[PDB]
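Dear U.,

Please find below the material for section 3 of the report. The protein was modelled together with E4H; I have listed the sequence and SMILES used, followed by the predicted complex structure.
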Amino acid sequence: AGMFRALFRQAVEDDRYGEFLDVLAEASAFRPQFASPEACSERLDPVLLAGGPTDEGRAVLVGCTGTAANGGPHEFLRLSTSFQEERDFLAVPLPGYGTGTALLPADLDTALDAQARAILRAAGDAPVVLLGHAGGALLAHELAFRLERAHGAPPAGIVLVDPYPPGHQEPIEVWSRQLGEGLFAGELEPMSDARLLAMGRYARFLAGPRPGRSSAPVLLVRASEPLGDWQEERGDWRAHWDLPHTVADVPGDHFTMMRDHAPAVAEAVLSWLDAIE
Amino acid sequence: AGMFRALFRQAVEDDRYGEFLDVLAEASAFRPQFASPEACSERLDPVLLAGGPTDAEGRAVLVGCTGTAANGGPHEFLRLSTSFQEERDFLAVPLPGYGTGGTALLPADLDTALDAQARAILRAAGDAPVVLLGHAGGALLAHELAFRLERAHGAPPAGIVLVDPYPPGHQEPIEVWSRQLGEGLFAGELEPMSDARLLAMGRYARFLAGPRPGRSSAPVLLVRASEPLGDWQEERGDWRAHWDLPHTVADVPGDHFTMMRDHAPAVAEAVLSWLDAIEG
Ligand SMILES: CC[C@H]1OC(=O)[C@H](C)[C@@H](O)[C@@H](C)C[C@@H](C)C(=O)/C=C/[C@H]1C
Ligand SMILES: CC[C@H]1OC(=O)[C@H](C)[C@@H](O)[C@@H](C)C[C@@H](C)C(=O)/C=C/[C@H]1C
Ligand SMILES: [Mg+2]
């Protein structure tokens, strides 16, 4: 495949994921960009992956696609099956990953505004609950804040599946080799250099200073098994969010909670939606 | 074809050449390397591009030190070398990291690459004194090689010809003309610059910007372009190439690029006169 993918493979092999991610972020600055939501080069139409029962005003779930360069429309497929007959589940694309390759957002807010527009159109009058996993969880919260601040529309809730926010990401840094190996393992096709640059650009966005906190209630879903080695004395390795409305612990690790154990995540979401409604 | 080449093209358009070179250098860290001269994946056998008179011996041979340009290679000294035919042997030595046959390993550090060049040159030159010659980045490389030959190989060259060098204390013209320098790289493409070769160029650029000993005892011929490559506001000062304490300075027609492209005979003429002066 491409040179960036080859370099990434080597970086992961040499346990230098973080350093390589910084290269991707810097390199992404030289890709053509969109500087306003209207200038976004791709159709961000959310896809309906599960349907709820017939016979307002029940919340609709919106899956916020994560940053993984091997990811895309397949991210929520396993999870979404458990929502069939329970809740409408829409997956929204992350701008800059589409195909000629898509323009990268100039900044995170520009991407979030593009997403917000597409979601509000698709959702209509139904309340929206945003859901994301890992980096996608961080993106879900940032989107929630933007919706509230700039679109007069705070979501009804946010489901954060294994978030590792700034100040709480030591375990994810320590396990970066596993994260990189997971990306290669999860390839259905070679990760394009264009998507690797998108991934770096969003990683850098999510590491920067962000502008405040959503008023929406949060469900924190945590994996129960560590992805890699962790000394007990070094503290809790688990995902974190400040003062969530509800915490749910599920089987599996950072990865397998969304595969093998996706029904457990779905079960936690469904119960919580009933409680907040 | 390749994303690094696409990015480079955009960086040039946006007048961010320097910034992108830094990205190339950082990215190069993740290419497979050679850490000892012997582990070099390429045959650095110099090519004889011109022959001196059969009449030899004790007479200096010229060694062309290939520069860092990603669009470069064996074609670099073809025009210049014709002017040495029947005057001086001219050997062109490849720069490690640019070859194919699969792509070549990058040097771990500059000294490792210089040691690989040094071994190939000494083998090729035999008993003959060596005068190193390089243009632009290749000129900086010629000096670094000369010092290494002296310090690590007991073999200081008889001389060094630096064609239009811009050393670390005098980089402003290269900075001001960076867009023009990048555009020249795409103009000089015989084929699309490979991502592997762009990374090699970034790696060497970083090497050359870093702490370098260390000063060759060999006498220097500084050859300078007489025309500015791009626009230059007069009060910035002197745009011309520079070297500290050269043995002799020669000015030739053309700019940074055309001095070698259109006026290579004038470069050759300067070298031949100086070689006679330092030998006789
Ligand atoms: C050294 C590995 C990095 O972690 C990531 O790349 C995670 C997986 C990703 O979600 C990215 C999108 C998380 C963001 C916030 C980031 O910059 C992370 C930096 C390191 C913790
Ligand atoms: C923005 C232009 C750059 O200059 C080069 O890349 C020149 C052409 C090259 O010889 C390089 C190999 C010269 C070295 C010293 C370098 O790293 C230069 C960096 C910038 C001044
Ligand atoms: Mg001086």
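For the text of the report, you could mention the following: Chain B touches chain A through 22 residues (CB under 8 Å).

Regards,
Y.
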